[PDB]
Design a binder for this molecule. Structure first.
Ligand SMILES: CC(C)CCC[C@@H](C)CCC[C@@H](C)CCC[C@@H](C)CCCC(=O)OC[C@@H](O)[C@@H](O)CO
Ligand SMILES: CC(C)CCC[C@@H](C)CCC[C@@H](C)CCC[C@@H](C)CCCC(=O)OC[C@@H](O)[C@@H](O)CO
Ligand SMILES: CC(C)CCC[C@@H](C)[C@H]1CC[C@H]2[C@@H]3CC=C4C[C@@H](O)CC[C@]4(C)[C@H]3CC[C@]12C
Ligand SMILES: CC(C)CCC[C@@H](C)[C@H]1CC[C@H]2[C@@H]3CC=C4C[C@@H](O)CC[C@]4(C)[C@H]3CC[C@]12C
Ligand SMILES: CC(C)CCC[C@@H](C)[C@H]1CC[C@H]2[C@@H]3CC=C4C[C@@H](O)CC[C@]4(C)[C@H]3CC[C@]12C
Ligand SMILES: Nc1nc(NCCc2ccc(O)cc2)nc2nc(-c3ccco3)nn12
Ligand SMILES: CCCCCCCCCCCCCCCCCC
Ligand SMILES: CCCCCCCCCCCCCCCCCC
Ligand SMILES: CCCCCCCCCCCCCCCCCC
Ligand SMILES: CCCCCCCCCCCCCCC
Ligand SMILES: CCCCCCCCCCCCCCC
Ligand SMILES: CCCCCCCCCCCCCCC
Ligand SMILES: CCCCCCCCCCCCCCC
Ligand SMILES: CCCCCCCCCCCCCCC
Ligand SMILES: CCCCCCCCCCCCCCC
Ligand SMILES: CCCCCCCCCCCCC
Ligand SMILES: CCCCCCCCCCCCC
Ligand SMILES: CCCCCCCCCCCCC
Ligand SMILES: CCCCCCCCCCCC
Ligand SMILES: CCCCCCCCCCC
Ligand SMILES: CCCCCCCCCC
Ligand SMILES: CCCCCCCC
Ligand SMILES: CCCCCCCC
Ligand SMILES: CCCCCCCC
Ligand SMILES: CCCCCC
Ligand code: NA
Length: 390
């Protein structure tokens, strides 16, 4: 086989390239949120926590990955810290992605309660708790779920390690049952399936809200046509009963309120005429509603639709981030499943292990590109920072 330094040189060069780009792009994200008060909202506090975890991949996890590739002699607990630190950063990423999804689900489900429920102060406390939990989950092997008690004595003596020392190789110190059942199934796949569930629920909520606005609108217009081609008070009365219910529903901001006030008032004016049997006076009064609709109600309808469409576009952008996380991490998890569940299978070759490691690290480069492409407020801020400060 080719001298191992040759494959190592390629691996290390690739890891350093990824580290440089992870740091630069994620620093830009943080700098943008810092500069632009329009980016300073609770959603973007989780974006910043996620960017911090990605900067720590370039600054720490990649140098650790380079180190552990050598199989250097180390105290087994020092070795575990180097092997497991990236699991803390990845767990922190999962908590941030889950928080973003739930945040967007609260914003679309109860918009009026959002600002008083989801505050900056609460977000900061959740981020701190999530970072503590990420340390506890990713460094669980350091608590004694590890192979330090069953060292590879042949590798230890071949590499010349001292006493209490092991050849520091990931799959010699970190148990595969930890990596498959605890890390992958419980701590990554369950949260990814939950996020999939939350985004589903966001898109279902948006679609139901957009459908309800269109139905209210159509109830308005159809009942207007019922009233026109009507032939007695009872008919005009029944339609105006529908319209009034529909109009109070659409209502649920001074220029807005004046609109629904006029409309409801006109509906009651025409209701009083109908109840008095005055059918043509009722119909004339109902014809008035058309100018209230054209001048106020169509404006509110188009603004509510535009807000919901923006929320759908934003939820697609954030879900793409989750999909790219899944694409970059699953290969390594799936290889661990083959290693663990298929002892009769040939182990994935080294070149494939290193490709899957590098792919996982590339995930710390991509988020700044998704933001620049998909989110106008980020792209415009990145442009200002690059033109001005470079
Ligand atoms: C990547 C780049 C674009 C930016 C990096 C920024 C800076 C701050 C990186 C900092 C790197 C350090 C944290 C690296 C730590 C390296 C440690 C883990 C190396 C350990 C090697 C060691 O212990 O020596 C080996 C022998 O001592 C052993 O065989 C005997 O005990
Ligand atoms: C995010 C996505 C949209 C795009 C991601 C792009 C991905 C595929 C990264 C591309 C990099 C590769 C084309 C090149 C990497 C080649 C590396 C993995 C070769 C390593 C060879 C190897 O096995 O060396 C290690 C061993 O020889 C041993 O010495 C221990 O280091
Ligand atoms: C602020 C940032 C830069 C601090 C980074 C400190 C890092 C590099 C320190 C903290 C704990 C350290 C480890 C502690 C113990 C051991 C076991 C020893 O047998 C080999 C070195 C090794 C594996 C150390 C490597 C360096 C290490 C990982
Ligand atoms: C999430 C997307 C990108 C799917 C990627 C699936 C990857 C991880 C799959 C596709 C084919 C798979 C390989 C197919 C066959 C073998 C041979 C066996 O002896 C060890 C596992 C190994 C080497 C598998 C590892 C995982 C593998 C590389
Ligand atoms: C993509 C998300 C939603 C699901 C993840 C699917 C994972 C857990 C699946 C996909 C392919 C599966 C593997 C397919 C084939 C084998 C070989 C068998 O001898 C042991 C089980 C094993 C190794 C499976 C383990 C679980 C596995 C890796
Ligand atoms: N299985 C595994 N191996 C390694 N590194 C060692 C690659 C290797 C595997 C076998 C061998 O004999 C020599 C080297 N890093 C690893 N990182 C992860 C990981 C992180 C998150 C999910 O899986 N899994 N993983
Ligand atoms: C991109 C800047 C320069 C890139 C670094 C060059 C890579 C050469 C370093 C080789 C060191 C190898 C150490 C031992 C590896 C053996 C692992 C089995
Ligand atoms: C918002 C600021 C981020 C806060 C980060 C602080 C994290 C401190 C370290 C966590 C301590 C947990 C210890 C559990 C693992 C012990 C294994 C040796
Ligand atoms: C296993 C599910 C993975 C599916 C991937 C979803 C991503 C879709 C990509 C379309 C939109 C991408 C926007 C910009 C792409 C830049 C990539 C660096
Ligand atoms: C070896 C380093 C790998 C980093 C690859 C990251 C890809 C990010 C997407 C860039 C797309 C830019 C297209 C511009 C037209
Ligand atoms: C402010 C952080 C700068 C840290 C630079 C650390 C460089 C680490 C070199 C490791 C040498 C290990 C060689 C073993 C003999
Ligand atoms: C900054 C406030 C401290 C946060 C306290 C974390 C509470 C931990 C509760 C149970 C821990 C379960 C860890 C799973 C391994
Ligand atoms: C054999 C070395 C083990 C070191 C573990 C000592 C620290 C206690 C762990 C407390 C974790 C609390 C985190 C909050 C859930
Ligand atoms: C989302 C699917 C998760 C389920 C994957 C579980 C696979 C268990 C594999 C058992 C293999 C047993 C091998 C014995 C020879
Ligand atoms: C990084 C994940 C995608 C990798 C796709 C490559 C598939 C080739 C697998 C062949 C390896 C077979 C070796 C076993 C003897
Ligand atoms: C705007 C409030 C968000 C604060 C998030 C900062 C996260 C920093 C954690 C650093 C841990 C790296 C090891
Ligand atoms: C309100 C915006 C504040 C930006 C916080 C920057 C956090 C960067 C921490 C990176 C740590 C990596 C070592
Ligand atoms: C006594 C040698 C092995 C002990 C391993 C300690 C690693 C954890 C300390 C790191 C501190 C983080 C800043
Ligand atoms: C600039 C960052 C330097 C990368 C750290 C390389 C550490 C490799 C250690 C080899 C252990 C014997
Ligand atoms: C991979 C993104 C490239 C960023 C271009 C330069 C921005 C500099 C940020 C400050 C360190
Ligand atoms: C575990 C991550 C969940 C974060 C939820 C988002 C805000 C809720 C505050 C009441
Ligand atoms: C592997 C399941 C997670 C995928 C979620 C992506 C949403 C489009
Ligand atoms: C259903 C799980 C039992 C199989 C365990 C296989 C571990 C090699
Ligand atoms: C024996 C090496 C085959 C594949 C090399 C890696 C592809 C990028
Ligand atoms: C210049 C960095 C060299 C990488 C470690 C051998
Ligand atoms: Na990450």
């Amino acid at each position: 086989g080719a001298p191992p330094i040759m494959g190592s040189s390629v691996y290390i060069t690739v890891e350093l390239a990824i580290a440089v780009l992870a740091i630069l792009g994620n620093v830009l994200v943080c700098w943008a949120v810092w500069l632009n008060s329009n980016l300073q909202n609770v959603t973007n506090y989780f974006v910043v926590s996620l960017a911090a975890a990605d900067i720590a991949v370039g600054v720490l996890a990649i140098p650790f990955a380079i180190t552990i590739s050598t199989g250097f002699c180390a105290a087994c607990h020092g070795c575990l810290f180097i092997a497991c630190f990236v699991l803390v950063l990845t767990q922190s990423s999962i908590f941030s992605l889950l928080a973003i999804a739930i945040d967007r689900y609260i914003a679309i489900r109860i918009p009026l309660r959002y600002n008083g429920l989801v505050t900056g102060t609460r977000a900061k406390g959740i981020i701190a708790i999530c970072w503590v939990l990420s340390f506890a989950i990713g460094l669980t092997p350091m608590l004694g779920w590890n192979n330090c008690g069953q060292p590879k004595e042949g590798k230890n003596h071949s590499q010349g390690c001292g006493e209490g020392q092991v050849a520091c190789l990931f799959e010699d110190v970190v148990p595969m049952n930890y990596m498959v059942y605890f890390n992958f199934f419980a701590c990554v796949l369950v949260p990814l399936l939950l996020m999939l569930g939350v985004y589903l629920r966001i898109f279902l909520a948006a679609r139901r809200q957009l459908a309800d606005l269109e139905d209210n609108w159509e109830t308005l217009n159809d009942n207007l046509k019922v009233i026109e081609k009507a032939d007695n008070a009872a008919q005009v009365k029944d339609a105006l009963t529908k319209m009034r219910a529909a109009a109070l529903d659409a209502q649920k901001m001074k220029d807005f309120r004046h609109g629904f006030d006029i409309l409801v008032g006109q509906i009651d004016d025409a209701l009083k005429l109908a109840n008095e049997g005055k059918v043509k006076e009722a119909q004339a009064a109902a014809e008035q509603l058309k100018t209230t609709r054209n001048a106020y109600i169509q404006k509110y309808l188009e603004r509510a639709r535009s807000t919901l469409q923006k929320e759908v576009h934003a939820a697609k952008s954030l879900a793409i981030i989750v999909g790219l996380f899944a694409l970059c991490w699953l290969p390594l998890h799936i290889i661990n499943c083959f290693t663990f569940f298929c002892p009769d299978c040939s182990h994935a070759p080294l070149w494939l292990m290193y490709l899957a490691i590098v792919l996982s690290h590339t995930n710390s480069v991509v988020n700044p590109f998704i933001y620049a492409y998909r989110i106008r407020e980020f792209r415009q801020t990145f442009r200002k920072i690059i033109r001005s400060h470079v």
